[PDB]
Design a protein around this ligand. Structure first.
Ligand SMILES: [N-]=[N+]=N[C@@H]1[C@H](O)[C@@H](COP(=O)(O)O)O[C@H]1n1ccc(N)nc1=O
Ligand SMILES: [N-]=[N+]=N[C@@H]1[C@H](O)[C@@H](COP(=O)(O)O)O[C@H]1n1ccc(N)nc1=O
Ligand SMILES: [N-]=[N+]=N[C@@H]1[C@H](O)[C@@H](COP(=O)(O)O)O[C@H]1n1ccc(N)nc1=O
Ligand SMILES: [N-]=[N+]=N[C@@H]1[C@H](O)[C@@H](COP(=O)(O)O)O[C@H]1n1ccc(N)nc1=O
Ligand SMILES: [Mg+2]
Ligand SMILES: [Mg+2]
Ligand SMILES: [Mg+2]
Ligand SMILES: [Mg+2]
Lengths: 210, 213, 213, 210
């Protein structure tokens, strides 16, 4: 069959992955539908030595649409829509290097693609049969983002905040937030909005059933 | 010869003090001078009982709640300043959460600026202000500034800072500060960076002090 | 000899048109005159396809969404007005949800006011404005004004009005209009009733037109 | 035993009664705790013929603290806290008349007292062992209030709105909203905030159990 591709966007630490996890979990509550969640973060571009030098100095914008391998995203997603098995790269964010190992993703009935810029490119955007944007208060997101980067990346607090003000927040307002208008459903308060998520799940189930 | 009281509000680390400072500096650049004094709501915290200080040590005291401040003393102080009287302002030790014996003498001035997250909360205090300004700054910009302020305090954990913010500061802002925003004369987006708005406010103050243009 | 463009935003029935009207009237009272024209975003709705009009008849078309407006035509029109050109403005029939054949000629002016709930949404349009104002009015005050406007339309059900508001108008305001509020130079609480704020804005406009005080 | 008195306040159509119903319903989910919900609207004062004339002309403020029989409220609530059976008046809002029939309320383990001005009087406020304030967007509340009054009171639309602007909204900002500072828990989004309500229920259960 043909997979049902769902695109999920939203600002940093807005709860995109939590909303996808909730969707899969509620899909199984109601044979079973196979569901897989993909992340745009897996498709960061391979950096040159100069770009990696700027990144280690905190001078590379990883929130700009150019930072993502949009060509690899488009090709991976188009092969999924045609029902094939694909290989997903494994990107190391602490070292800014795409690892050699890949992850095999077998065909599923529903595929969720989440990322801060999932709706930016028009070609990938037209592949999504449903599009969701996760909305969360900017300070709530920042404090999640700060705790997340302190532990998962081991970075300094002052350097996290200066990176946020320099790159993350401006790129959100210039590149991510405008893609909100392409969303079929906008979800305020993220995964805690179980009412909205339940409507989305019921909509997904009715499209697959008939 | 009546002091001109200006109330300044806005969320934590929105720029209330910087806006007050910019107004003071701009008022002096166009002097042909004016006595200007700045008061802060943070000087009027209540003295905590030993029961309350115990909860405070466990991070279970809401310092952002209206009850945390001496609203009676705020009103009495600002009313006397309005009448041209000289007032005594307490000094508050935040480590001890108590008031030192020494007070600060504050003399009347041409312009008195009072800044506070809850400056507009009480109706009696709000009516004392002949001009009211609200500083509107992005929440994540404010949180970044607020974290850097609090973290400079020695032995103040970051996860303690962020959890106090999520539990007390953000809810108190939404529930007690934001409903008063409607009462301002002018709302200043982006804080002290908004000089077109601040220049208009300063020009309006100069013309009130001069009895006209 | 360049027209001075002012962008005005704020939620539904916040007072955008009244604020524009008050600015026009106050600019003429202190003339020693200035040509001022007012444009509205509601003139730039897109023509609806027969598929879209069908959903509109079932109350399932979002007229508050950014896609409902001709952003290309808005930008092209305001860019030509900025250059001092004369523009043709469409006329929109709301019953038919289509554009009449007749257009309205709009000549350049000293001051051009553009008002719209989504006036600041697009970055290209937002940068054309040399001054940006946001009108901040209580939501229940706005809803009361909005219901009385819509209910005067013949055969327009009240429960249809309120459900269109809850489904489309309020969410679009929170998700598309409010994030642009930060870009305004001045935020006007309580709308056209705020004459201290409006007087400051008018005085600032007069001084830009005069090249100084 | 002694009943556990809970006071619930909030603006018009904020969901106060819906929050009380949800609390009772979740209390029984977890012998059983007997719970009763009382409404401040039952204790409107008996109007004189002149006051009733102004009310029929739309010139009486039913949102002012003086409109409620605070003496009867205090006495009814104090007798409840001492464990007695009380009689609750039955007020007719369309006619502004207290009916002669009363409702018998037998002792319960938990008593919820909801009303726009439940925390206004300090004497009634000190009787509440827990205090809750329900927060909801003003336009959401107005549209609920409008539909509610169109049907339950049969009033004209223009007269509902003018009453709201003249009395309801100003009295909310002057009398109701300031009592928010007495609340132990503030509930944004009303009954839809099942996370906050669950914490309240668990707190109630732990106070009753031990
Ligand atoms: N910096 N920065 N911001 C980006 C994005 O905002 C976030 C995307 O996902 P999200 O968690 O915001 O949803 O990843 C961060 N990233 C990317 C590569 C790397 N080597 N280190 C990182 O930190
Ligand atoms: N926690 N907390 N919040 C409060 C207020 O929100 C902020 C004042 O407002 P502002 O400076 O943000 O304008 O001070 C914090 N405070 C209070 C006492 C203390 N011993 N240490 C503190 O940190
Ligand atoms: N529905 N709705 N919302 C829209 C907008 O929110 C409002 C414009 O903004 P404003 O007048 O509130 O400033 O017009 C309404 N509209 C649009 C088309 C039509 N045929 N009838 C209407 O009523
Ligand atoms: N008018 N008015 N406002 C009041 C209050 O706002 C509301 C209290 O309860 P709430 O539903 O706002 O929670 O009752 C209304 N009332 C009272 C007596 C009467 N004879 N007719 C009424 O309509
Ligand atoms: Mg993620
Ligand atoms: Mg300060
Ligand atoms: Mg208009
Ligand atoms: Mg009720």
């Amino acid at each position: 069959g043909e997979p049902f591709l769902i695109g999920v966007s939203g600002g940093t630490a807005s709860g995109k992955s939590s909303v996808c996890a909730k969707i899969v979990q509620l899909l199984g509550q109601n044979r079973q539908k196979q569901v897989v969640i993909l992340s745009q973060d897996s498709f960061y571009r391979v950096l040159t030595s100069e770009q990696k030098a700027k990144a280690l100095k905190g001078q590379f914008n990883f929130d700009h649409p150019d930072a993502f391998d949009n060509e690899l995203i488009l090709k991976t997603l188009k092969e999924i829509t045609e029902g094939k098995t694909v290989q997903i790269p494994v990107y190391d964010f602490v070292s800014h290097s795409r690892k050699e190992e890949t992850v095999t993703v077998y065909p599923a009935d529903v595929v969720l693609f989440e990322g801060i810029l999932a709706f930016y490119s028009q070609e990938v955007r037209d592949l999504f049969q449903m599009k969701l944007f996760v909305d969360t208060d900017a300070d709530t997101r920042l404090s999640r983002r700060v705790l997340r980067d302190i532990s998962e990346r081991g970075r300094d607090l002052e350097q996290i905040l200066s990176q946020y003000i320099t790159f993350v927040k401006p790129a959100f307002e210039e590149f991510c937030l405008p893609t909100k208008k392409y969303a079929d459903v906008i979800i305020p308060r993220g995964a805690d909005n179980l009412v909205a998520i339940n409507l989305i799940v019921q909509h997904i189930q009715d499209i697959l059933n008939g």
